[PDB]
């Protein structure tokens, strides 16, 4: 159970939009992906500016129409009842992406 965000970094500008894919290799039965904003709010598939998409063992973070208040590090956590809470590489079952806005 490993997780990675592609792209790994985000060089966004104000107004532009950027997508981030979180893919988990080694998904075991009870595992599920969840995104978290810089402030720690769990992002649900809402019809809002910053939303999330569920696509097979992956989950995409779409940041439409960017603004300066969106910058921060977003977390993608693979959690579950019977889901490993440790990566094959003795790492946490989560991945981070640092998005930075400009002008």
């Amino acid at each position: 159970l490993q997780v990675d965000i592609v792209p790994s970094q985000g060089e966004i500008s104000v107004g532009e939009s950027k997508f981030f894919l979180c893919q988990v290799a080694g998904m075991l039965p009870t595992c599920e992906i969840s995104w978290f904003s810089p402030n720690g709010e769990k992002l649900t598939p809402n019809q809002q500016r910053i939303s999330v998409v569920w696509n097979d063992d992956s989950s995409t973070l779409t940041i439409y129409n960017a603004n300066i208040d969106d910058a921060g590090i977003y977390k993608c956590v693979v959690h579950g009842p019977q889901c490993p809470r440790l990566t094959w590489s003795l790492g946490l079952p989560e991945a981070t992406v640092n998005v930075k806005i400009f002008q």
Partner: protein, 368 residues
């Protein structure tokens, strides 16, 4: 009508093949990371040794949970739980021998594998669909007393250091009483390990070097205190080949245990024969920590000498100057008897030896 052959052969060739750890194991022993594997563009290092490691386990510092229990899942603590695969269905791991034979009752080619080989075949035959998993397969630990097969979620074996073990899930491979019945298995362990890989210790024996017609003592070794065979097996294991670059099986993998003097002599050169000594036990890093086989192949020399004489005006005696039959040697002088020999061997020393050991346990010919 009788002369001594010029071909210098070693009758221990086939017997000692399983102790060529570099050739038969071909990977690290203490810390096995012989093969690299990528998974969806993510480099990894996984064990690759082809021989089982009897008595090996993982000791977790500042913890009181066996590394064979599953990893923490969901709302468990990280410090809680071990290295094993998540037991959420109890169908991937652990798996008893009865459940293994039952799940493969129709696979004829698998119902012919031994217990350890069946556990290994099961554990390495797991790949989640939808993932690259290019040669990334999990290792296993088979408990021969519990008859249980455990898949390992974590392939790491040692994570010591000033950061991880200082005021953090620290672990190290080791051998102790609790692991004596375990068999550490990588994804590449030979199914025919019973004949190709070491297991039981060799009693009344000590590893030596075959010069020309006799097994001589290994000059360069490192002596260590050992109260019993188990500690000598633990000492050699801690000094064995370690991949913590790849070792490919090179390292201090062999040891001769003096049960009388209670000493443990380790070395890093592959052995080519055995010396029959009632006071010594030959052990390896892969061998069981306690099982000992006391039957020394006494007729190995006599059987080979008689074989050549049967294949043949004149008789060409092989270059074997040791035997439990004093006549077969046909010594020009009186052979010397070995008091500590369980086989009652006799050696002929008044002979021109065509080989010689010097430097770092290397056997070289003087003149061709």
């Amino acid at each position: 009508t009788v002369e001594r052959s010029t071909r210098m052969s070693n009758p221990w060739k086939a017997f000692m093949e399983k102790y060529d750890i570099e050739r038969t194991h071909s990977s690290g022993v203490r810390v096995d990371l012989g093969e690299d594997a990528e998974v969806e563009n993510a480099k990894y290092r996984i064990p690759a040794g082809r021989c089982p490691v009897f008595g090996k386990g993982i000791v977790i510092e500042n913890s009181a949970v066996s590394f064979l229990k599953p990893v923490a899942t969901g709302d468990q603590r990280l410090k809680d739980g071990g290295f094993a695969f998540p037991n959420a269905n109890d169908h991937i791991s652990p798996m008893t021998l009865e459940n293994l034979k039952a799940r493969y009752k129709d696979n004829v080619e698998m119902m012919k594998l031994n217990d350890i080989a069946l556990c290994r075949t099961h554990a390495a035959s797991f790949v989640m669909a939808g993932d690259q998993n290019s040669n990334y397969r999990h290792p296993a630990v088979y408990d021969e007393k519990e008859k249980t097969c455990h898949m390992l979620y974590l392939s790491a074996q040692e994570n010591m250091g000033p950061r991880y073990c200082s005021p953090v899930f620290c672990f190290k491979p080791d051998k102790d009483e609790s692991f004596e019945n375990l068999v550490y298995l990588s994804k590449n362990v030979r199914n025919d390990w019973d004949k190709k890989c070491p297991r039981k210790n060799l009693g009344n024996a000590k590893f030596g070097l075959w010069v020309d017609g006799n097994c001589e003592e290994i000059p360069y070794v490192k002596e260590v205190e050992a109260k019993d065979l188990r500690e000598c097996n633990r000492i050699v294991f801690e000094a064995s080949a370690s991949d913590q670059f790849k070792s490919k099986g090179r390292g201090f993998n062999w040891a001769n245990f003096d049960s009388v003097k209670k000493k443990c002599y380790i070395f890093n050169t592959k052995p080519t024969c055995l010396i029959n000594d009632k006071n010594f036990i030959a052990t390896t890093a892969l061998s069981h920590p306690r099982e000992v086989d006391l039957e020394f192949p006494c007729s190995i020399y006599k059987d080979e000498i008689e074989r050549e004489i049967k294949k043949q005006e004149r008789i060409v005696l092989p270059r074997i100057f040791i035997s439990n039959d004093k006549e077969s040697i046909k010594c020009p002088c009186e052979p010397e008897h070995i008091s500590q020999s369980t086989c009652n061997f006799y050696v002929c020393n008044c002979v021109e030896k065509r080989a010689e050991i010097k430097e770092n346990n290397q056997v070289v010919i003087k003149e061709e």
